[PDB]
Design a protein around this motif. Structure first.
Motif, PDB file in Angstrom:
ATOM      1  N   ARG A   1       0.888  -1.252   0.040  1.00  0.00           N
ATOM      2  CA  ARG A   1       0.110   0.050  -0.014  1.00  0.00           C
ATOM      3  C   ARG A   1       0.796   1.128   0.020  1.00  0.00           C
ATOM      4  O   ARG A   1       0.524   2.071  -0.750  1.00  0.00           O
TER       5      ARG A   1
ATOM      6  N   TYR B   1      -5.097  -8.701  -4.167  1.00  0.00           N
ATOM      7  CA  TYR B   1      -4.398  -7.446  -3.563  1.00  0.00           C
ATOM      8  C   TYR B   1      -3.543  -7.879  -2.501  1.00  0.00           C
ATOM      9  O   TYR B   1      -2.175  -7.650  -2.402  1.00  0.00           O
TER      10      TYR B   1
ATOM     11  N   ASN C   1       2.714   1.678  -3.284  1.00  0.00           N
ATOM     12  CA  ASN C   1       1.594   2.245  -4.269  1.00  0.00           C
ATOM     13  C   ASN C   1       1.564   3.670  -4.319  1.00  0.00           C
ATOM     14  O   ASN C   1       1.564   4.355  -5.148  1.00  0.00           O
TER      15      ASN C   1
HETATM   16 CL   LIG Z   1      -3.178   0.762  -3.634  1.00  0.00          CL
END
Ligand SMILES: [Cl-]
Ligand SMILES: [Mg+2]
Lengths: 241, 243, 195, 231, 167, 235, 240, 250, 244
Positions: free
Chosen positions: A110, E10, A113
């Motif tokens: 995360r 993810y 990103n």
């Molecule tokens: Cl993300």
């Protein structure tokens, strides 16, 4: 030559602002190390208090992101704290939406990103920091995942960051070439910290007092940092063999 | 080159030159200090008397946040007022949700993140102030200093502005000669001395001394200005030490 | 209540519309024309809630006139009817729907055929030989079902319409103060004075 | 040089050139004086004409019954800032039934000016203001710079040749502060102060602009034959 | 199910029941019961086996046995009579299908067949569509097939379903 | 490049100072205020003889008691006139009276500095706003793209301004009649104009308390031109 | 949203983007307007660099705004469509609210207003277009011809030309057009318009378009043969 | 603050070149080699796991990504730019297709969507193009097996076989000689391993090579039984051991 | 701030040209040549794929010829990605018109809309223009068979025969020479291929380097058929016309 000011490609297919962000990473002149035990993940970082007027207790580059995830930063403290607050927010939001503790590798992805976006969008600058996330994950076990200003991330058996990273890296590489295993075969986290400090001493060639080091430990269901007196007990044990 | 024309641009060094230029504005400003005592913190500042026409004691520089946090700064005074305004919003929102007055470390990071945000975009200018702030919370006394980059740490003593080197040297003596710690009343006297000693860097124009303190014993953990007899007692002590 | 009738004969479309405008127990006018010329060969008659009727018709008139200037072409009645239906179909789920019921009479120059379209305030559309809106529709439909023939002349169509209005005057309880009749053919749109 | 293109750019010595250029617009402006006693606070302004057919540009703006300023620089920017003060004075009255403190009026002007010095696309204000008022702590005089710096003073002057008036007030400080319950004598001291900034031209009937506020005196502006008494 | 699949891709982890549960309840709560979805959510994941129920206002509950719908009272009556701790797989299928039968027979809103899905730890979930067929219609007395030409036809025509042809 | 709202080292806004140059290239406009009324005159300056001059509109009515002459990029004035008319009417709607000439001028000047990165640049046109009100009588104002306005007993703007203003400096007194002011505008226009002044390439207008704002007929202006020629030939 | 100020003043008080927009017009094919006693004629140049063109479907140079008003242009063709669309919408909007078609002067004032707005609005460049707007006001027999340009200024013309070599055809009109006695008939007015274009065009073949607008929404576009008869008669009179 | 970069950062140069797209393609050229080969009964995509450090666990970094059960993707160029594209590609397969039609998109239309996202980073305000080229292999009922390339411009082309990145020019020549229209999947894997060996310097084994196929349905990977029409994903990533087995018959 | 880095994509040059439009047209001049020829009984679209490979799957490949509806097709010259953005917009407008009026969109109305989008990117938004030129082949019952072109400027014109992309100057001369008004589709097919065969920068014109399409009333009775030629069908028409 405005292709060196913002995050657009140079004729060589390079992003110079990203490369210069990597250089900011070493501005603090601090070296970090991360290793994995059977049951734990240990992270040690050099602590330098150059001003006598400073309150040494507030000088830290290790962050408790969640109860399970710890983060050590290599870079200036403003960008470190920017990244810390965001990771703390993202970890809390994840648990609320999906009903389980954000895994170490997922938080890493995360934050990586978010970093990628600063390399593609012009108005935002990259953060001048490398983030090393540690935990004992409930699925993957002891975990080390590291992010950089390019938006790159990967897992690690062990890792090192800072000006003298290559010296620490090769020292760890050589140990794992002997043992032929992906971790420190040790029961207690105390002895895994003793290994981490010992192999940093051997790699940097410097001795450490209790005030020179900063230690973070990840066990099953908590990440915590050691006090000066906890480190002193660790240093005494190393000297006595 | 051109790396220093736009804020948030990394130089080939990995430096933000616009932030380093902001630090120059700070170095140009008057001297401001902070001292962490046994059960609180003391703040003091140098006010340059440009003209006789300035009304004494009227142009107040030290600013309160909530009721327990003192803030003093050196550099562009308006930029400091803007930062304190944000601090007052952050402290208000924290108290509104969590009830308890904002802890000092918690307040430090609120200013920290806001100042750091003014280094992420080239649409804004970095803050032209270094801010010395602190007070008393549930975990005791805390003194902080915050730079244009968004960098802050905790301090035993802090100094910024034109007379910072002089001030820092005097603070370092107090830390060595008092390991057991300094009392709140002693820290007011010492604060007066250090500003008078640091005025040698601004010796052209005469100045006006301004002190404030938050002490658990002396002010009940609230931020108050030092006035009347206690201010005159500190001025007398300071005047005696330079002679 | 308001009478709007449409009959499609062999070579034309005739629209009869009541000339009375009343709000409650008051007669506001006895010479009202409830018609707008959308294009040279397309005519629309409307009945419904006060204000909405004229506002909707003038809005549709402006859009069709805009299309005519922009393309230097006349939209076919089928196309004009579809545009009108869709505007009404949007309005039902709007904050305040248009309460307007319309008859569209047009001559399609490409097919050389007259066309009559009946559309209600919901955007319900059908092509019919004859059509009507309101209380008047109940009566006039039954009469037209018996008499109407598809190869009728314009003169025959007017006589049948004349009969419908006469029967409506006797049978209807409200005074609609007569009708205005307009014919739509290849030559264009004209108003029949004698009725 | 390379660092004056916009207000968002610091120079290598930590200067903001766009702000310093704005500060220059004030020095080009016509002279205005401010001074106060314990009872009254006075503004004196030299108005500037375009030519002999033209009127003399108004310098003094009323903000409330107890507060107003004189301007030197861009008149339209004084109109924007005075309008903002009028609103803030007005908000204080309506919501809190409280006349806005002069000190707090200063703090609000400062913070409005600052935002225009830290954001891209905008520009600094090109005007300097002398705010006088009488509130719950007596007579007040403030000096506003579009840098955001606001200062409380016994007396001051801004605009072209302002240094002459400022020196006179610095000598007369001990005299004019004691002029309590005598408005005419305090204005005389203000007219004698601005006189130290004149060259070639002298104070005429349509040239001079005076304003006063005090203990039992609302903020009133004097122009025309109303200032002939003081010439 | 879509958002859970994207989350799984993810995170590189098999989805958890607590995730599907959390996402369902926050969605239903948003719409204040106007989305009239009453669900029993079961599954096995790396954490273990889970059984939840979710009401349309956004409330959830945990149990060893749950029932929902118009036939819940008929079904809960059987579960409260025959449920014990440490049930085998065979016993739990028997208990579950019996509880549905109670609903089919005694509830007018329930009927026809019993559909079962078994989710065992460390195994593939087996979906048993029409596990029981207790309500199969009997042969009719008569064939109502008509003689051809019985229906009056006004008109006939070929419908062109093919695209515009070549040449 | 550089900011649109940027100050110069002398403390002047670049874009404002540049717009003032655009106005210097504009056709001449003159205003004279008297106790009997305010006269407004303009040079039309047609680019060709095929251009129907009567279509050149550089004198414009704002309300019955306020006229307006323009000089510079005249297209820029259309939205300023639109705002002025809207302000004058809106004030009459809110207060049941005629708006003060100064208040109307102040309203127009509030648009001036609304430019940045609001409109992309300042206005490239100056206005002479003439009118009457009960409080301050007959008034003439000069509205600039800086946002500043000055009241004037008499004023000239455009290409022939500094020549015209020097002439107005000598000629104007407090006892001027309206007839005297008309001839004086025609005299100074005829002096600074490239082409020979007639009723087709110049236009007069006035604002009196009684009759309000009027644009003169070509036939009326023609007679005042003939009256001017004779009185100049009289000595 | 993109706010950048593209039309700004220069030290000599010029707006270069507006002046460069006039250069786009200069490049455009020639357009001419001539008003007679009881008509207005719009002549337009078609550059013969493009043959194998389908003249049936190719966008024509003269566009009807309403049944009684026409607009021709010189400059960027794409830009002209945006002004024509806005004008056509405003024409129907005026009919809808005022219950009367636009005057020629009103429609001109609107189009000129749009052109001005695009010279002091952020993130936009001016229109690279000048327009000739011609027609008759509702229930009026007085001919009307107006011109607009990128700056937004507009004015009324006895006769006017715009586009490439407009300086030449304006020179012709200035000596050949008498104000005291304008072209009395349609014939005379069309002849003078064709004559004015023949000064610049090249071949009198498919290079000249003529549109005649008469009072009471009477608008017709002349064909190739009809224009060719004017071209023939003009040169046969010239041979003397 | 606010994103005040509302303008394009990719413009045409006097020569009619789009600089930022050319420079993006240059970044792709520096990238590690990846290839794709299409057989009669499947497709193979392959690349080298260039490990940044031996302490780094290269298994945790996935260069070959599942987009849908029947579509896989591999890249050459900037890894972070690929990772966020895979996230956007997975999401758009759901939002723009599966949530509408109730089935996964065919290869060519998912490619079309990825292509659109990349075109927008080529024209939209205050952004640079993506510094990657994608190879996307897929199967769908009506189009059968297919292989597509997507470039920073947003342009895409279908391939019988191709290669991108470091040694693409040499790789493409090798593939042109070996490829026929009668290749079985095992033949295409053998050719893929032969081609990739030429561009790799160091260790060449299952631990340093990342390879996935689009082939037969894998019911053993579906995770549930009972629905006859659901026969499982056609995308399978080969294990370390499975690669090493085929390197002995090399 | 951000002003420093703005290319200003929507400004005039001192000569009154649009920089970005002119540069985009330079880009398009390097793209594969596309030709459209309009006959009495139909329209032909012929286009050249840019230097292909032997390992490119041709039968599933599309870069040049795209379907907008059943009556209208386009040939592309420029950035394929940029074209696909505009093609999807056009496909939606065509279906919007059909939904509103219950009639297929007239060719010009669709062309004008796509052209008006391109125009916008040149006058506002500060974004680069679309690097695309289209040839529109279409039929409606007002004007029958129609050929149009649009370019990044947003300008559009109608044609009997036209070329876009590489070597248009040469291509347009060859078309202007051999084209007659009474020409038929079979003749127009031959002309299009003969023109590409002479203008091509390649050594020879083969099936694997072409995309071909016809719009014919050669559909059983009173209707219109679009034919996107298959690889084998392009190979056959190349032998028939005698080029291979
Ligand atoms: Cl993300
Ligand atoms: Mg960036």
């Amino acid at each position: 030559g405005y292709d060196r000011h913002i995050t657009i490609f140079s004729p060589e297919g390079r992003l110079y602002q990203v490369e210069y962000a990597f250089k900011a990473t070493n501005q603090t002149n601090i070296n970090s190390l991360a290793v994995r035990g059977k049951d734990c993940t240990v992270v040690i970082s050099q602590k330098k208090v150059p001003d006598k007027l400073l309150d040494p207790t507030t000088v830290s580059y290790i962050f408790c992101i969640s109860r399970t995830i710890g983060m050590v930063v290599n870079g200036p403290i403003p960008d470190a704290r920017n990244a810390a607050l965001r990771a703390k927010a993202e970890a809390a939001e994840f648990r609320y939406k999906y009903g389980y503790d954000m895994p170490c590798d997922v938080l890493a992805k995360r934050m990586a990103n978010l970093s990628q976006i600063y390399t593609q969008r012009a108005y935002m600058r990259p953060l001048g920091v490398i983030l090393t996330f540690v935990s004992v994950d409930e699925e993957l076990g002891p975990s080390i995942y590291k992010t950089d200003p390019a938006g790159y991330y990967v897992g690690y058996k062990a890792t090192a960051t800072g000006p003298k990273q290559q010296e620490i890296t090769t020292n760890l590489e050589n140990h794992f070439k002997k043992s032929k295993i992906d971790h420190i075969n040790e029961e207690s986290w105390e002895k895994v910290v003793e290994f981490a400090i010992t192999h940093m001493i051997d790699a940097l060639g410097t001795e450490f007092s209790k005030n020179d080091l900063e230690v973070g430990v990840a066990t099953k269901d908590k990440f915590f940092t050691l006090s000066a007196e906890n480190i002193e007990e660790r240093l005494v044990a190393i000297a006595e063999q | 080159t051109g790396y220093d024309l736009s804020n948030s641009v990394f130089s080939p060094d990995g430096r933000n030159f616009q932030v380093e230029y902001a630090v120059k504005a700070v170095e140009n400003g008057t001297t401001s200090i902070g001292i962490k005592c046994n059960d609180g913190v003391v703040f003091a500042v140098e006010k340059l008397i440009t003209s006789k026409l300035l009304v004494p004691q009227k142009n107040v520089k030290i600013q309160v946040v909530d009721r327990h946090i003192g803030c003093v700064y050196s550099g562009l005074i308006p930029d400091g007022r803007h930062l304190v305004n944000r601090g007052r919003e952050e402290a208000a929102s924290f108290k509104k949700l969590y009830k308890t007055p904002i802890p000092i470390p918690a307040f430090a990071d609120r200013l920290g993140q806001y100042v750091q945000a003014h280094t992420l975009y080239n649409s804004v200018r970095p803050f032209g102030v270094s801010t010395i702030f602190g007070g008393v919370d549930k975990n005791g006394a805390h003194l902080y200093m915050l730079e244009p980059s968004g960098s802050y740490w905790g301090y035993k003593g802090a100094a910024t502005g034109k007379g910072r080197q002089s001030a820092k040297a005097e603070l370092e003596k107090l830390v060595d000669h008092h390991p057991e710690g300094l009392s709140a009343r002693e820290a007011v006297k010492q604060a007066a001395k250090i500003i008078y000693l640091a005025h040698e860097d601004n010796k052209e124009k005469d100045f006006e001394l301004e002190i404030s303190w938050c002490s658990l014993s002396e002010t009940n953990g609230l931020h108050k200005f030092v006035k009347g007899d206690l201010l005159q007692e500190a001025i007398d002590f300071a005047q005696k030490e330079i002679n | 209540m308001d009478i709007i009738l449409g009959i499609r004969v062999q070579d034309s479309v005739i629209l009869a519309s009541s000339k009375a405008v009343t709000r409650g127990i008051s007669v506001l006018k006895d010479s009202d024309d409830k018609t707008r010329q959308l294009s040279p060969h397309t005519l629309m008659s409307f009945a419904g809630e006060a204000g909405d009727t004229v506002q909707f018709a003038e809005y549709i008139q402006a859009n069709i006139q805009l299309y005519s200037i922009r393309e230097d072409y006349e939209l076919s009645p089928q196309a004009v009817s579809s545009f009108v239906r869709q505007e009404l179909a949007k309005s039902i789920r709007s904050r305040r729907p248009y309460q307007v019921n319309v008859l569209i009479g047009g001559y399609d120059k490409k097919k050389n055929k007259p066309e009559l379209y009946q559309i209600d305030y919901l955007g319900t559309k059908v092509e019919l030989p004859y059509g009507a809106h309101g209380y008047s529709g109940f009566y006039t439909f039954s009469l037209l079902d018996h008499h109407y023939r598809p190869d009728m002349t314009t003169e025959e169509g007017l006589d049948l319409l004349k009969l419908c209005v006469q029967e409506l005057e006797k049978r209807m309880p409200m005074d609609f103060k007569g009708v205005i009749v307009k014919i739509v053919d290849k030559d264009g749109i004209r108003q029949v004075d004698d009725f | 040089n390379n660092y004056d293109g916009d207000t968002v750019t610091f120079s290598p010595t930590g200067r903001l050139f766009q702000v310093e250029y704005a500060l220059e617009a004030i020095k080009q402006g016509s002279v205005t004086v401010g001074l106060r006693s314990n009872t009254h606070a006075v503004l004196v302004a030299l108005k500037r004409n375009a030519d002999e057919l033209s009127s003399y540009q108004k310098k003094i703006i009323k903000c409330d019954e107890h507060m107003g300023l004189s301007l030197a620089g861009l008149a339209p920017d004084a109109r924007v800032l005075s309008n903002y003060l009028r609103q803030q004075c007005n908000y204080s009255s309506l919501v809190f039934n409280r006349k806005l403190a002069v000190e707090r009026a200063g703090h609000l002007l400062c913070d409005k000016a600052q935002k225009n010095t830290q954001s891209y696309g905008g520009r600094p204000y090109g005007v300097g203001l002398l705010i006088i008022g009488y509130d719950k702590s007596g007579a007040h005089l403030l000096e506003f710079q579009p840098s955001g710096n606001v200062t409380e003073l016994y007396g001051t002057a801004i605009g072209a040749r302002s240094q002459g008036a400022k020196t006179y007030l610095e000598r007369t400080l001990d005299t004019f502060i004691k002029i309590d319950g005598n408005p005419d004598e305090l204005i005389k001291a203000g007219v004698e102060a601005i006189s130290q900034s004149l060259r070639d031209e002298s104070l005429t009937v349509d040239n001079l602009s005076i304003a006063i506020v005090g203990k039992d005196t609302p903020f009133t502006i004097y122009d025309g034959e109303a200032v002939a008494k003081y010439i | 199910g879509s958002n859970i699949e994207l989350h799984s891709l993810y995170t590189s982890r098999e989805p958890r029941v607590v995730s599907a549960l959390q996402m369902l309840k926050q969605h239903l709560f948003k719409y204040q019961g106007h989305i009239g979805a009453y669900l029993i959510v079961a599954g096995v994941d790396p954490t273990g086996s889970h059984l939840f129920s979710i009401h349309a206002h956004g409330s959830t509950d945990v149990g060893y046995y749950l029932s929902l719908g118009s036939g819940s009272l008929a079904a809960m009556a059987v579960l409260e009579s025959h449920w014990k701790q440490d049930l085998t797989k065979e016993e739990a299928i028997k208990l579950a299908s019996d509880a549905i039968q109670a609903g089919i027979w005694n509830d007018l809103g329930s009927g026809s067949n019993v559909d079962v899905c078994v989710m065992e730890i460390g195994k593939d979930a087996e979906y048993l569509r029409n596990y029981l067929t207790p309500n199969v219609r009997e042969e009719k007395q008569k064939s109502y097939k008509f003689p051809r030409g019985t229906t009056a036809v006004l008109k006939e025509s070929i419908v062109n379903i093919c695209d515009i042809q070549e040449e | 490049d550089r900011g649109v709202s940027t100050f110069s080292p002398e403390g002047r806004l670049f874009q404002v100072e540049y717009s003032l140059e655009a106005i210097k290239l504009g056709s001449t406009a003159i205003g004279i205020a008297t106790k009997e009324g305010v006269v407004l005159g303009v040079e039309k300056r047609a680019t060709s003889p095929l251009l129907e001059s009567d279509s050149i509109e550089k004198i414009v009515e704002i309300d019955r008691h306020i006229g307006c002459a323009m000089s510079g990029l005249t297209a820029d004035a259309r939205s300023m006139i639109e705002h002025a008319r809207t302000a004058a009417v809106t004030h009459n709607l809110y207060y049941d009276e005629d708006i003060n000439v100064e208040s109307l001028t102040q309203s127009v000047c509030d648009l001036a500095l609304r430019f940045g990165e609001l409109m992309s640049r300042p206005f490239g046109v100056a206005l002479l706003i003439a009118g009457h009100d009960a409080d301050d009588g007959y008034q003439l104002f000069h509205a600039e793209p800086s946002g500043t306005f000055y009241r004037y007993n008499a004023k000239a703007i455009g290409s022939g301004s500094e020549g015209a203003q020097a002439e107005l400096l000598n000629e104007w007194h407090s006892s001027l009649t309206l007839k005297e002011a008309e001839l004086l505008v025609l005299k100074i226009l005829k002096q600074v104009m490239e082409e020979k002044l007639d009723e087709n390439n110049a236009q007069l207008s006035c604002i009196t308390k009684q009759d309000g704002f009027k644009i003169y007929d070509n036939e009326k202006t023609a007679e005042l031109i003939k009256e001017l020629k004779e009185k100049e030939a009289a000595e | 949203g993109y706010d950048r100020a593209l039309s700004i003043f220069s030290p000599d008080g010029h707006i270069f983007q507006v002046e460069y927009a006039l250069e786009a017009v200069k490049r455009g094919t020639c357009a001419v307007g001539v008003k007679g006693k009881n008509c207005v004629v719009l002549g337009c140049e078609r550059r013969s660099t493009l043959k194998l063109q389908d003249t049936r479907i190719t966008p024509s140079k003269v566009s009807k705004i309403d049944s009684h008003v026409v607009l021709s242009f010189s400059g960027l063709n794409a830009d002209s469509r945006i002004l024509i669309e806005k004008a056509r919408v405003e024409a129907q909007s005026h009919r809808l609210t005022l219950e009367d078609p636009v005057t020629v002067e009103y429609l001109t004032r609107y189009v000129a207003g749009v052109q001005q707005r695009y010279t002091q609005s952020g993130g936009v460049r001016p229109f690279g277009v000048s327009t000739l707007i011609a027609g008759f006001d509702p229930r009026d027999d007085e001919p009307k011809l107006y011109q607009t340009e990128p700056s937004g200024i507009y004015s009324s013309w006895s006769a006017q030309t715009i586009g490439r070599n407009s300086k030449t055809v304006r020179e012709f009109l200035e000596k050949n057009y008498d104000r005291k006695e304008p072209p009395a008939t349609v014939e005379e007015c069309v002849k003078l318009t064709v004559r004015s274009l023949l000064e610049v065009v090249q071949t009198g073949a498919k290079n000249i378009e003529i549109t005649v607008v008469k009072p009471d929404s009477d608008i017709v576009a002349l064909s190739s043969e009809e224009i060719n008869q004017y071209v023939t008669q003009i040169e046969q009179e010239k041979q003397e | 603050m606010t994103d005040r970069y509302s303008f394009s950062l990719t413009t045409f140069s006097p020569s009619g070149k789009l600089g930022q797209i050319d420079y993006a393609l240059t970044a792709v050229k520096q990238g590690v080699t990846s290839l794709g080969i299409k057989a009669t009964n499947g497709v193979v995509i392959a690349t080298e796991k260039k490990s940044s450090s031996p302490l780094a666990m290269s298994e945790t970094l996935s260069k070959v990504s599942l987009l849908t059960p029947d579509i896989g993707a591999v890249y050459s160029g900037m890894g972070p730019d690929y990772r966020v594209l895979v996230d956007k590609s997975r999401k758009v397969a759901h939002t723009s297709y599966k949530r509408i039609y109730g089935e996964y998109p065919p290869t060519k239309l998912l490619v079309s969507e990825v292509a659109k996202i990349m075109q927008e980073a080529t024209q939209s305000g205050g952004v640079r193009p993506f510094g990657v080229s994608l190879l996307i292999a897929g199967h769908d009922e009506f189009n059968g097996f297919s292989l597509y390339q997507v470039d920073p411009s947003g342009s895409y082309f279908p391939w019988k076989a191709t290669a991108i990145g470091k040694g693409s020019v040499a790789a493409k020549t090798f593939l042109e000689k070996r490829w026929n229209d009668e290749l079985e999947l095992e033949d295409a894997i053998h050719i893929a391993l032969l081609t990739l060996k030429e561009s790799v310097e160091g260790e060449f084994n299952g631990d340093t090579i990342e390879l996935a196929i689009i082939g037969d349905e894998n019911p053993d990977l579906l995770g549930y039984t009972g629905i006859p029409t659901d026969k499982g994903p056609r995308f399978r990533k080969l294990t370390s051991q499975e690669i090493n087995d085929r390197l002995e018959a090399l | 701030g951000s002003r420093r880095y703005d290319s200003r994509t929507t400004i005039f040059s001192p000569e009154g040209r649009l920089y970005q439009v002119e540069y985009a047209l330079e880009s398009i001049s390097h793209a594969g040549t596309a030709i459209g020829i309009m006959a009495s009984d139909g329209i032909v679209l012929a286009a050249e794929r840019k230097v292909t490979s032997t390992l490119l799957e041709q039968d599933t490949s599309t870069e040049k010829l795209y379907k907008l509806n059943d009556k209208i097709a386009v040939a592309v010259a420029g950035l394929t990605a940029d074209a696909e953005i505009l093609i999807n917009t056009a496909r939606i407008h065509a279906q919007n018109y059909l939904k509103t009026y219950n009639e297929d969109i007239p060719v010009e109305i669709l062309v004008r809309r796509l052209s008006d989008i391109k125009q916008g990117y040149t006058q506002h938004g500060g974004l680069r223009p679309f690097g695309v030129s289209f040839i529109y082949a279409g039929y409606d019952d007002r004007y029958g068979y129609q050929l149009y072109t649009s370019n990044p400027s947003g300008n559009y014109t109608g044609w009997k025969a036209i070329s876009v992309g590489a070597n248009t100057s040469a291509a347009q001369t060859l078309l202007q020479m051999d084209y007659k008004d009474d020409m038929k589709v079979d003749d127009a097919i031959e002309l299009a291929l003969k023109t590409l065969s002479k203008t091509t920068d390649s050594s020879a014109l083969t099936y694997d380097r072409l995309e071909f399409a016809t719009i014919r009333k050669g559909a059983n009775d009173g209707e219109v058929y679009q034919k996107i030629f298959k690889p084998q069908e392009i190979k056959d028409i190349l032998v028939k016309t005698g080029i291979t």
